[PDB]
Design a protein around this ligand. Sequence first.
Ligand code: CL
Lengths: 117, 117, 117, 117
Amino acid sequence: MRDPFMEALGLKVLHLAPGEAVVAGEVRADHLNLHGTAHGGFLYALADSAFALASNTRGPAVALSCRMDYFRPLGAGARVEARAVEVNLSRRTATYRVEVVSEGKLVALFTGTVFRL
Amino acid sequence: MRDPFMEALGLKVLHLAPGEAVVAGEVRADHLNLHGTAHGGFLYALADSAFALASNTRGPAVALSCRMDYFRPLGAGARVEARAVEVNLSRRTATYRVEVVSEGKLVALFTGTVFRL
Amino acid sequence: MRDPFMEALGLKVLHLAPGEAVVAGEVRADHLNLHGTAHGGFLYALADSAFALASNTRGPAVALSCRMDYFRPLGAGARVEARAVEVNLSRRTATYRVEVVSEGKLVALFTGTVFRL
Amino acid sequence: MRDPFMEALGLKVLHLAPGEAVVAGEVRADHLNLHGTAHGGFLYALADSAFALASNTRGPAVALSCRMDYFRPLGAGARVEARAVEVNLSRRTATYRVEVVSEGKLVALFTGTVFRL
Ligand SMILES: [Cl-]
């Protein structure tokens, strides 16, 4: 398993088991947006990566629809984690909840559904 | 206006006007996922960037909730664009639709709502 | 085609063609919520009905994920329509955009994806 | 507190406390769709009602964006519940997760964000 984008973003896996995964990273200078806070795409990439790993432990799967709800902004240097858990596993689709956490606070909530190939 | 993450991803602005924006990029080797296709986070970052620029033409705004629907995978070298248009503009919130297109095909659809500061 | 819930809500079809549908209704006294405005479930039911009809013109399909963005409240007596159009049609999934309109104003935006049986 | 639509749908409250609520109902003949299963609008109305009650325990609030993920169909006679819990409470917005359950099975997952008036 090699994910070029995860590697480019400096992400690491803290846990991987059937139906679940935790991916972590640190907000670097190149991850900031025009507001000076962690770009929504960086936080989403983090959650999506945990989502991808968790869902693929059940077999090949690709994202269909994902929702990202942002609660708190993060600045450079912030250590963040995306914790993915399985909500539903069906024959051709599956859904996961991914909590994005930093220093014990829920920074964002990701909800995604995949199509099982 | 300087967005470190957009710059790091090699994104460029093709259009910016009141309530709308178009951001473009090319899928590079470092943008691929474990599947060998454009990482969902890269495509989302592209759409989110157009969303951010379009929404901020109305004044400071931050994302609340965003949905990303994926329709077609993209490989390295693909030229992609995210076209953001305003769907609703309220006093404290606004919503935008962002079409992600590559070679005339709709690759994904992004729907997002911001909170106006 | 008989839909008990659509009938119970007093909904009517104003258009049905391949990949698209328009469903209309009027906000009645029994459709109001604790706020005295059209219940979110009534507006969603309206959009979902147009979504269901439009998607099923392509063959049997059931909803996977749907998003409803609310922009303006409606009171009793308001005439409302849900206009569904096809955004993407794939082999096993399809996505539709449904605009909820009343007196020329966009009251809400519904985005939904179905699984094709 | 009187909600005409909840009453019309035969819904009842099983729990209400700060930041949370449980609403229950039974799928009646008039709640079925063209497929002969519980209409998506009925299940959404159920979840939305729990969402509305839970969010309003914190003060007046109206829905901004809601997502409904469907996992299992329900037939006439099914007893269903929507359990709403608070995910995030901010100054002007709040987010809730609502699990739709029937006979111990997760039938659907609702995720919604409100604007606090
Ligand atoms: Cl959504």
